[PDB]
Design a protein around this ligand. Structure first.
Ligand code: A1ACZ
Length: 385
């Protein structure tokens, strides 16, 4: 029953996803709001602790006590230059507890501090409860994914987050390996198969090159930009609309925190529409000083606004190929991961760079990692019996 069942969890920097392999198919499980991915956010309020969508939805009202980006801290020392650099950009407090970072918040009127693995365990507990509500019984066996560049300390702290969350961690697997499993790229028989995984998420960009030799995975190269993702494209749309509002009304809105956040969420929505329509409409009632902001933008203008950022995704692709010592024609498969890879210009740039090659994109890119993790979790729990 429950003992023979296992889930696959993609514990992402900005979003998390849970899947289950049963009756010959993967089911990506929707949360209680009907969403197939859940924000990796934890909010501490005057009455309760919120996780996911509810935590993300009140971030503007409670920024000091809404934790996100815990994956940037997990398994790291406080003194680590990555931690010191990131801390300057977060609205929540990060404290030092014996060279270990803790996030410090106000919860039910009291000061509380949490280890990054405790924050990640709350996200994991939510994913576990989403699976349990779908299945009708508690599932405790799980495969949890991590970036291919995570070291032993980051992998151990992720497994610790799983234990705190009440999960039996069957295995910690690499995100690009889970994505290659999702597409069945490890079941092509004999001979070395070179796979490039292009992973463009909400806040990070990762390029991974794997060799699959008779079912055995080997990471040949990892490249990317830890501070490039979908939110930089939302911000480019924000700056455009702030300049358009100034041209139409002779009013600078950039200082009104509420106006900027409402414009930001509308821009994120319009950006998603631009992946399947050649135009998107913004409809903001009373954006600033009672002025409605009803406008539109073409996919062509959006592509111009992010042009330099889209083109920058090809430098880590070239870098990964040189580190792996492979030419473009030596790569057998190209896999898309992350919601941002739905952007047609991004697909066109990658396809042209690989001389007109087909891309593996039939599995929802923001779900491919949980999909593969779910497949692996089913194989592993069957072998355990
Ligand atoms: N249809 C889409 N077109 C463009 N961007 C998208 C799309 N879907 C998602 Cl999710 N994202 C973005 O992916 C990230 C999460 O993986 C977020 O930045 C989200 O906006």
């Amino acid at each position: 029953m429950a003992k023979a069942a296992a889930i696959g969890i993609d514990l992402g920097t900005t979003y998390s996803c849970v899947g289950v392999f049963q009756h010959g198919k993967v089911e990506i499980i929707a949360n209680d709001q009907g969403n197939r991915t859940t924000p990796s956010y934890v909010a501490f309020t005057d009455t309760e602790r919120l996780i996911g969508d509810a935590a993300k939805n009140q971030v503007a009202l409670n920024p000091q006590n809404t934790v996100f980006d815990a994956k940037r801290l997990i398994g790291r020392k406080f003194g680590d230059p990555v931690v010191q650099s990131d801390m300057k950009h977060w609205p929540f407090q990060v404290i030092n507890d014996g060279d270990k970072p803790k996030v410090q918040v106000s919860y039910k009127g009291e000061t509380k501090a949490f280890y990054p693995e405790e924050i990640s365990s709350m996200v994991l507990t939510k994913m576990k409860e989403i699976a349990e509500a779908y299945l009708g019984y508690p599932v405790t066996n799980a495969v949890i994914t991590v970036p291919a560049y995570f070291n032993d300390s980051q992998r151990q702290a992720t497994k610790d987050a799983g234990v705190i969350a009440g999960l039996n961690v069957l295995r910690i697997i690499n995100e690009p390996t889970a994505a290659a499993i999702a597409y069945g790229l490890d079941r092509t028989g004999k001979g070395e198969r070179n796979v490039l995984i292009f992973d463009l998420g909400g806040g990070t960009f990762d390029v991974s090159i794997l060799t699959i030799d008779d079912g055995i995975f080997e990471v040949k190269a990892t490249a990317g930009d830890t501070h490039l993702g979908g939110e930089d494209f939302d911000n480019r749309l924000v700056n455009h609309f702030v300049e358009e509002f100034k041209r139409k009304h002779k009013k600078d809105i950039s200082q009104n925190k509420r106006a900027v956040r409402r414009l930001r969420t509308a821009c994120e929505r319009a950006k998603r529409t631009l992946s399947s329509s050649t135009q998107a409409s913004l409809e903001i009632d009373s954006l600033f000083e009672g002025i409605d902001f009803y406008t539109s933008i073409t996919r062509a203008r959006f592509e111009e606004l992010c042009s330099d950022l889209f083109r920058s995704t090809l430098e880590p692709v070239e870098k990964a190929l040189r580190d792996a010592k492979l030419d473009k024609a030596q790569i057998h498969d190209l896999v898309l991961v992350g919601g941002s890879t739905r952007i047609p210009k991004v697909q066109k740039l990658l396809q042209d760079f690989f001389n007109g090659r087909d891309l593996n994109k039939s599995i929802n890119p923001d779900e491919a990692v949980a999909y593969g993790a779910a497949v692996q979790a089913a194989i592993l729990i069957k072998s355990t019996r």
